[PDB]
Amino acid sequence: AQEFITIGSGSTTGVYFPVATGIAKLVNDANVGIRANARSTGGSVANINAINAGEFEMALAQNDIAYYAYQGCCIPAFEGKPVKTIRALAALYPEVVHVVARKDAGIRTVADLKGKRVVVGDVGSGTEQNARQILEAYGLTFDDLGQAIRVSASQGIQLMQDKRADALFYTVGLGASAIQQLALTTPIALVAVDLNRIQAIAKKYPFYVGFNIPGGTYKGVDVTTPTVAVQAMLIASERLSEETVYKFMKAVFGNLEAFKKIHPNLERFFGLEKAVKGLPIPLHPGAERFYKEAGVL
Ligand SMILES: N[C@@H](CCC(=O)O)C(=O)O
């Protein structure tokens, strides 16, 4: 096809990557004049910066990060430096904050992370921002950690396996390959995140919702873990034409069955009505047209 669209995602072993890869496949197989490809990246912040720079046309990103970027606030990457070019295409599924600790590492709560070697997320990840915020809720900062490691998901679980890291954060949909792998190769435990503590700073970071990771989701973790979650979204540049986005939406979301087959999180959590519910940034004109046509707006 002649209109090229690159979709920013995340680590190859996270959920954004397989989802973006699946979306690109649906668009390319539709033969509608669009040539799409998914790019692995550090995550939400890197993706939004790439769209702002005109390097990516679309990307997956957390709703909280998208809001901070659009409004130009809350986090260093966007404080006083708004990215008004991003638009929402659809809300997708919940991204849960996973706090994974090696057993016998002396870590039972977030407070125990003080002095430990922790993988806080990849460079340019939304994960790193959530990690800083959660630590703040417990009165800590990255300077209280023994080491704040920033690497990809694959690299992070390798460090855990080799005992070069004691804990790892990952804001990601349930069932992420990286987390499943980590649980299978290493004796781990999931650290809970107290919603009440998070609520104490909800005025600064208002997007967290309570979420329970069901016991048995990951190998060796049979107890349910109370934590928090944000929402994964598909975003795009306002520079894309209304018709390009519309055509794209039809090829991707036109056949819900085919779309949900891309990943278990979509099959489990995706819905057209929820796709336009409580968005943090404006909908792209082409998406608005699609949803109106679908009778959702
Ligand atoms: N939400 C994560 C990425 C999760 C994923 O790759 O599935 C981030 O922005 O860092």
Tab-separated table of C-alpha atoms and ligand atoms in Angstrom:
chain	number	residue	atom	x	y	z
A	1	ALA	CA	0.000	0.000	0.000
A	2	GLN	CA	1.099	3.619	-0.325
A	3	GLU	CA	0.129	5.254	2.988
A	4	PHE	CA	2.611	4.082	5.614
A	5	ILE	CA	1.645	3.857	9.276
A	6	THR	CA	4.064	2.880	12.034
A	7	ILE	CA	2.582	1.903	15.405
A	8	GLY	CA	4.729	2.404	18.492
A	9	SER	CA	4.339	-0.316	21.119
A	10	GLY	CA	6.615	-1.726	23.817
A	11	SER	CA	8.899	-4.632	24.695
A	12	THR	CA	8.516	-7.631	22.418
A	13	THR	CA	7.430	-9.713	25.426
A	14	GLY	CA	4.820	-7.272	26.723
A	15	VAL	CA	1.233	-6.928	25.472
A	16	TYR	CA	1.465	-3.747	23.352
A	17	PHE	CA	3.807	-5.399	20.853
A	18	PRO	CA	1.699	-8.449	19.993
A	19	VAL	CA	-1.410	-6.250	19.922
A	20	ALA	CA	0.186	-3.674	17.608
A	21	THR	CA	1.575	-6.482	15.451
A	22	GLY	CA	-1.909	-7.976	15.210
A	23	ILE	CA	-3.468	-4.624	14.373
A	24	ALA	CA	-0.900	-4.083	11.614
A	25	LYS	CA	-1.686	-7.526	10.215
A	26	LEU	CA	-5.422	-6.795	10.079
A	27	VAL	CA	-4.814	-3.515	8.249
A	28	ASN	CA	-2.341	-5.016	5.789
A	29	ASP	CA	-4.514	-8.050	5.060
A	30	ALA	CA	-7.444	-5.721	4.345
A	31	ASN	CA	-5.644	-4.296	1.297
A	32	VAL	CA	-7.027	-0.786	1.787
A	33	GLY	CA	-4.042	1.282	0.685
A	34	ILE	CA	-2.368	1.305	4.084
A	35	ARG	CA	0.979	-0.312	4.882
A	36	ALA	CA	1.332	-0.714	8.647
A	37	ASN	CA	4.110	-2.001	10.882
A	38	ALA	CA	4.569	-2.324	14.635
A	39	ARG	CA	7.732	-1.022	16.298
A	40	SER	CA	9.038	-2.280	19.633
A	41	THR	CA	9.898	0.654	21.929
A	42	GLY	CA	10.408	1.618	25.563
A	43	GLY	CA	6.702	2.236	26.046
A	44	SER	CA	4.194	5.058	26.543
A	45	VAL	CA	6.454	8.068	27.009
A	46	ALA	CA	8.746	7.101	24.129
A	47	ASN	CA	5.716	6.469	21.909
A	48	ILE	CA	4.099	9.820	22.590
A	49	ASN	CA	7.405	11.623	22.036
A	50	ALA	CA	7.748	9.761	18.732
A	51	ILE	CA	4.296	10.858	17.582
A	52	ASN	CA	5.058	14.433	18.630
A	53	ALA	CA	8.283	14.298	16.592
A	54	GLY	CA	6.412	12.942	13.579
A	55	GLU	CA	8.287	9.634	13.674
A	56	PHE	CA	5.277	7.412	14.472
A	57	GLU	CA	1.730	7.949	13.201
A	58	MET	CA	0.109	5.839	15.932
A	59	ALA	CA	0.946	4.029	19.148
A	60	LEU	CA	-0.344	2.221	22.211
A	61	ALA	CA	-0.097	4.220	25.445
A	62	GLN	CA	-1.453	4.374	28.990
A	63	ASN	CA	-4.383	6.724	29.531
A	64	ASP	CA	-2.618	8.492	32.401
A	65	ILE	CA	0.526	9.166	30.350
A	66	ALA	CA	-1.570	10.353	27.394
A	67	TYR	CA	-3.364	12.825	29.652
A	68	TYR	CA	-0.137	14.168	31.181
A	69	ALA	CA	1.308	14.597	27.690
A	70	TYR	CA	-1.731	16.331	26.216
A	71	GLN	CA	-2.050	18.699	29.191
A	72	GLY	CA	1.715	19.115	29.588
A	73	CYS	CA	1.912	18.313	33.289
A	74	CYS	CA	2.543	15.944	36.217
A	75	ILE	CA	5.632	14.143	34.887
A	76	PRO	CA	9.122	15.448	33.896
A	77	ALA	CA	8.804	14.307	30.287
A	78	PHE	CA	5.814	16.593	29.691
A	79	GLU	CA	5.815	19.156	32.513
A	80	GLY	CA	5.201	22.483	30.794
A	81	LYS	CA	5.765	20.771	27.442
A	82	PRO	CA	2.316	19.692	26.147
A	83	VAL	CA	1.840	17.380	23.162
A	84	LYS	CA	-1.382	18.668	21.611
A	85	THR	CA	-1.018	16.522	18.492
A	86	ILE	CA	-2.162	13.234	20.020
A	87	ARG	CA	-5.701	11.919	19.612
A	88	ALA	CA	-7.488	8.852	20.928
A	89	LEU	CA	-8.691	6.028	18.703
A	90	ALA	CA	-9.878	3.580	21.359
A	91	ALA	CA	-9.633	2.508	25.002
A	92	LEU	CA	-8.569	-1.160	25.015
A	93	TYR	CA	-7.963	-3.063	28.266
A	94	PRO	CA	-6.694	-2.637	31.848
A	95	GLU	CA	-2.957	-2.382	32.453
A	96	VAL	CA	-2.127	-3.692	35.898
A	97	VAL	CA	0.818	-2.553	37.960
A	98	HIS	CA	2.820	-5.713	38.608
A	99	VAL	CA	5.377	-5.482	41.418
A	100	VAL	CA	7.386	-8.711	41.257
A	101	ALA	CA	9.891	-9.695	43.925
A	102	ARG	CA	12.217	-12.662	44.224
A	103	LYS	CA	11.335	-14.838	47.222
A	104	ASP	CA	13.971	-14.725	50.019
A	105	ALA	CA	14.944	-11.237	48.898
A	106	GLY	CA	13.457	-9.624	51.998
A	107	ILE	CA	10.615	-7.946	50.117
A	108	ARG	CA	7.002	-8.322	51.278
A	109	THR	CA	5.731	-4.756	50.789
A	110	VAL	CA	6.545	-1.742	48.640
A	111	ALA	CA	8.292	-0.214	51.665
A	112	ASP	CA	10.768	-3.108	51.630
A	113	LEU	CA	12.075	-1.939	48.242
A	114	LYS	CA	14.297	0.559	50.042
A	115	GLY	CA	17.908	-0.442	49.422
A	116	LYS	CA	17.021	-3.101	46.836
A	117	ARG	CA	18.081	-3.454	43.189
A	118	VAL	CA	14.874	-2.777	41.273
A	119	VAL	CA	13.974	-2.842	37.588
A	120	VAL	CA	11.684	0.202	37.516
A	121	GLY	CA	10.688	0.000	33.868
A	122	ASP	CA	12.240	0.642	30.473
A	123	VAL	CA	13.643	3.977	29.345
A	124	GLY	CA	10.652	5.982	28.113
A	125	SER	CA	8.172	3.601	29.722
A	126	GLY	CA	4.877	4.419	31.362
A	127	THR	CA	5.936	1.768	33.898
A	128	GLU	CA	8.743	3.910	35.285
A	129	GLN	CA	6.295	6.741	35.942
A	130	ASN	CA	3.868	4.473	37.793
A	131	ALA	CA	6.794	3.052	39.778
A	132	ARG	CA	7.846	6.525	40.912
A	133	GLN	CA	4.260	7.353	41.875
A	134	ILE	CA	3.688	4.121	43.793
A	135	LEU	CA	6.974	4.570	45.645
A	136	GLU	CA	5.852	8.129	46.467
A	137	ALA	CA	2.637	6.738	47.977
A	138	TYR	CA	4.876	4.786	50.350
A	139	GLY	CA	7.174	7.725	51.085
A	140	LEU	CA	10.047	6.597	48.852
A	141	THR	CA	11.779	7.765	45.663
A	142	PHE	CA	14.213	6.126	43.236
A	143	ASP	CA	17.051	7.543	45.341
A	144	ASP	CA	15.942	5.231	48.162
A	145	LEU	CA	16.467	2.133	46.008
A	146	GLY	CA	19.799	0.317	45.952
A	147	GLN	CA	19.653	0.651	42.185
A	148	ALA	CA	16.986	1.935	39.776
A	149	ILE	CA	17.444	-0.239	36.690
A	150	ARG	CA	15.898	0.778	33.358
A	151	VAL	CA	15.825	-1.976	30.724
A	152	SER	CA	13.469	-3.882	28.421
A	153	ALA	CA	11.140	-6.595	29.699
A	154	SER	CA	13.360	-9.408	28.389
A	155	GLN	CA	16.471	-7.859	29.910
A	156	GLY	CA	14.626	-7.225	33.160
A	157	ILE	CA	13.470	-10.779	33.715
A	158	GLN	CA	16.964	-12.005	32.852
A	159	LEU	CA	18.415	-9.812	35.611
A	160	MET	CA	15.847	-11.277	38.009
A	161	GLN	CA	16.723	-14.820	36.936
A	162	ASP	CA	20.438	-14.138	37.470
A	163	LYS	CA	19.759	-12.509	40.851
A	164	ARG	CA	21.194	-9.203	39.611
A	165	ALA	CA	17.848	-7.592	40.451
A	166	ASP	CA	15.617	-8.139	43.487
A	167	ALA	CA	12.308	-6.796	42.183
A	168	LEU	CA	10.687	-5.629	38.954
A	169	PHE	CA	7.828	-3.259	38.078
A	170	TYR	CA	5.733	-3.629	34.923
A	171	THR	CA	2.509	-1.780	34.113
A	172	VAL	CA	1.058	-4.252	31.662
A	173	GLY	CA	-2.012	-6.242	30.722
A	174	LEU	CA	-2.527	-9.525	32.552
A	175	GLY	CA	-0.755	-12.530	31.060
A	176	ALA	CA	2.201	-10.650	29.611
A	177	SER	CA	4.675	-13.212	28.253
A	178	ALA	CA	7.534	-11.593	30.166
A	179	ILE	CA	5.757	-12.006	33.501
A	180	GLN	CA	4.647	-15.569	32.746
A	181	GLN	CA	8.229	-16.449	31.792
A	182	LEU	CA	9.658	-14.803	34.894
A	183	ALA	CA	7.274	-16.774	37.110
A	184	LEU	CA	8.190	-20.039	35.368
A	185	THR	CA	11.956	-19.543	35.615
A	186	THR	CA	12.230	-17.908	39.043
A	187	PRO	CA	10.617	-18.257	42.495
A	188	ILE	CA	8.689	-15.003	42.782
A	189	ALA	CA	5.902	-13.295	44.671
A	190	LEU	CA	3.662	-10.378	43.787
A	191	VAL	CA	3.779	-7.337	46.050
A	192	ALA	CA	0.439	-5.723	46.789
A	193	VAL	CA	-0.211	-2.022	46.275
A	194	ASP	CA	-2.540	-0.466	48.859
A	195	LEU	CA	-5.317	1.462	47.128
A	196	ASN	CA	-5.852	3.653	50.199
A	197	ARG	CA	-2.227	4.789	50.011
A	198	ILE	CA	-2.664	5.538	46.318
A	199	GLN	CA	-5.868	7.471	46.991
A	200	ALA	CA	-3.874	9.709	49.339
A	201	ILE	CA	-2.178	11.131	46.233
A	202	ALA	CA	-5.082	10.761	43.801
A	203	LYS	CA	-5.126	14.533	43.306
A	204	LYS	CA	-1.762	14.330	41.541
A	205	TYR	CA	-2.316	10.955	39.848
A	206	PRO	CA	-6.106	10.429	39.380
A	207	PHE	CA	-6.160	7.471	36.966
A	208	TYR	CA	-5.554	4.507	39.282
A	209	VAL	CA	-8.325	2.010	39.934
A	210	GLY	CA	-8.252	-0.975	42.258
A	211	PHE	CA	-7.542	-4.246	40.493
A	212	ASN	CA	-6.993	-7.790	41.742
A	213	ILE	CA	-4.579	-10.107	39.959
A	214	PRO	CA	-6.393	-13.453	40.388
A	215	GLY	CA	-4.468	-16.127	42.236
A	216	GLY	CA	-3.144	-18.669	39.765
A	217	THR	CA	-2.575	-16.145	36.982
A	218	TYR	CA	1.174	-16.729	37.175
A	219	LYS	CA	3.155	-19.826	38.150
A	220	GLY	CA	3.833	-20.019	41.878
A	221	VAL	CA	1.525	-17.119	42.719
A	222	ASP	CA	-1.647	-18.793	43.960
A	223	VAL	CA	-2.809	-15.985	46.249
A	224	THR	CA	-4.787	-13.106	44.757
A	225	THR	CA	-2.859	-9.823	44.668
A	226	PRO	CA	-4.606	-6.498	45.304
A	227	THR	CA	-2.989	-3.765	43.235
A	228	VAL	CA	-3.926	-0.909	40.902
A	229	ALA	CA	-4.406	-0.449	37.180
A	230	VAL	CA	-4.660	2.173	34.460
A	231	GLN	CA	-5.966	1.761	30.906
A	232	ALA	CA	-4.284	0.864	27.616
A	233	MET	CA	-5.254	3.030	24.643
A	234	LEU	CA	-4.603	3.235	20.922
A	235	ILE	CA	-3.662	6.801	19.971
A	236	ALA	CA	-2.796	8.596	16.738
A	237	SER	CA	-1.469	11.866	15.375
A	238	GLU	CA	-4.013	14.563	14.564
A	239	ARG	CA	-1.993	14.957	11.358
A	240	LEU	CA	-3.463	11.765	9.906
A	241	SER	CA	-6.419	12.538	7.653
A	242	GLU	CA	-9.949	11.839	8.843
A	243	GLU	CA	-10.505	9.355	6.014
A	244	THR	CA	-7.222	7.520	6.666
A	245	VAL	CA	-8.152	6.948	10.311
A	246	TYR	CA	-11.717	6.028	9.362
A	247	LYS	CA	-10.531	3.454	6.821
A	248	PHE	CA	-8.079	2.139	9.423
A	249	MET	CA	-10.789	1.843	12.100
A	250	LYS	CA	-13.048	-0.138	9.769
A	251	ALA	CA	-10.270	-2.570	8.868
A	252	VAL	CA	-9.305	-3.054	12.508
A	253	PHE	CA	-12.518	-2.781	14.529
A	254	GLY	CA	-14.979	-3.545	11.733
A	255	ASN	CA	-14.819	-7.256	12.518
A	256	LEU	CA	-14.844	-7.480	16.321
A	257	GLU	CA	-14.314	-11.247	16.240
A	258	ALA	CA	-11.054	-10.924	14.303
A	259	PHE	CA	-9.856	-8.052	16.485
A	260	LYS	CA	-10.460	-9.857	19.786
A	261	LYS	CA	-8.505	-12.873	18.510
A	262	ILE	CA	-5.329	-10.777	18.588
A	263	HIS	CA	-4.790	-11.190	22.338
A	264	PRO	CA	-6.584	-12.663	25.401
A	265	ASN	CA	-6.868	-9.219	26.992
A	266	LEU	CA	-8.898	-7.968	24.041
A	267	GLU	CA	-11.155	-11.027	24.072
A	268	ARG	CA	-11.615	-10.553	27.818
A	269	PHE	CA	-11.860	-6.767	28.172
A	270	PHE	CA	-12.486	-5.057	24.827
A	271	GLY	CA	-15.850	-3.549	23.963
A	272	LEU	CA	-16.941	-0.888	21.458
A	273	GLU	CA	-18.980	1.090	23.984
A	274	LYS	CA	-16.137	1.064	26.509
A	275	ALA	CA	-13.729	2.091	23.740
A	276	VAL	CA	-15.069	5.666	23.873
A	277	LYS	CA	-15.737	5.857	27.617
A	278	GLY	CA	-13.927	8.464	29.708
A	279	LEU	CA	-11.109	9.168	27.254
A	280	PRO	CA	-8.256	11.398	28.582
A	281	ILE	CA	-7.685	13.144	25.245
A	282	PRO	CA	-9.847	14.140	22.241
A	283	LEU	CA	-11.003	11.467	19.790
A	284	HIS	CA	-9.501	11.657	16.310
A	285	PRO	CA	-12.080	12.979	13.785
A	286	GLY	CA	-11.815	9.744	11.809
A	287	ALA	CA	-12.532	7.678	14.909
A	288	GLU	CA	-15.500	9.866	15.835
A	289	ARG	CA	-16.907	9.188	12.364
A	290	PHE	CA	-16.404	5.448	12.844
A	291	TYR	CA	-18.066	5.334	16.262
A	292	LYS	CA	-21.005	7.468	15.120
A	293	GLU	CA	-21.482	5.085	12.206
A	294	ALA	CA	-21.283	2.131	14.598
A	295	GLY	CA	-23.936	3.789	16.743
A	296	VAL	CA	-21.693	4.023	19.800
A	297	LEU	CA	-21.568	7.829	19.721
B	1	LIG	N1	2.161	0.335	29.576
B	1	LIG	C1	3.603	-0.030	29.492
B	1	LIG	C2	3.826	-0.996	28.325
B	1	LIG	C3	3.053	-2.290	28.477
B	1	LIG	C4	3.210	-3.231	27.299
B	1	LIG	O1	4.255	-3.177	26.617
B	1	LIG	O2	2.286	-4.042	27.075
B	1	LIG	C5	4.485	1.197	29.323
B	1	LIG	O3	4.016	2.186	28.727
B	1	LIG	O4	5.634	1.155	29.805
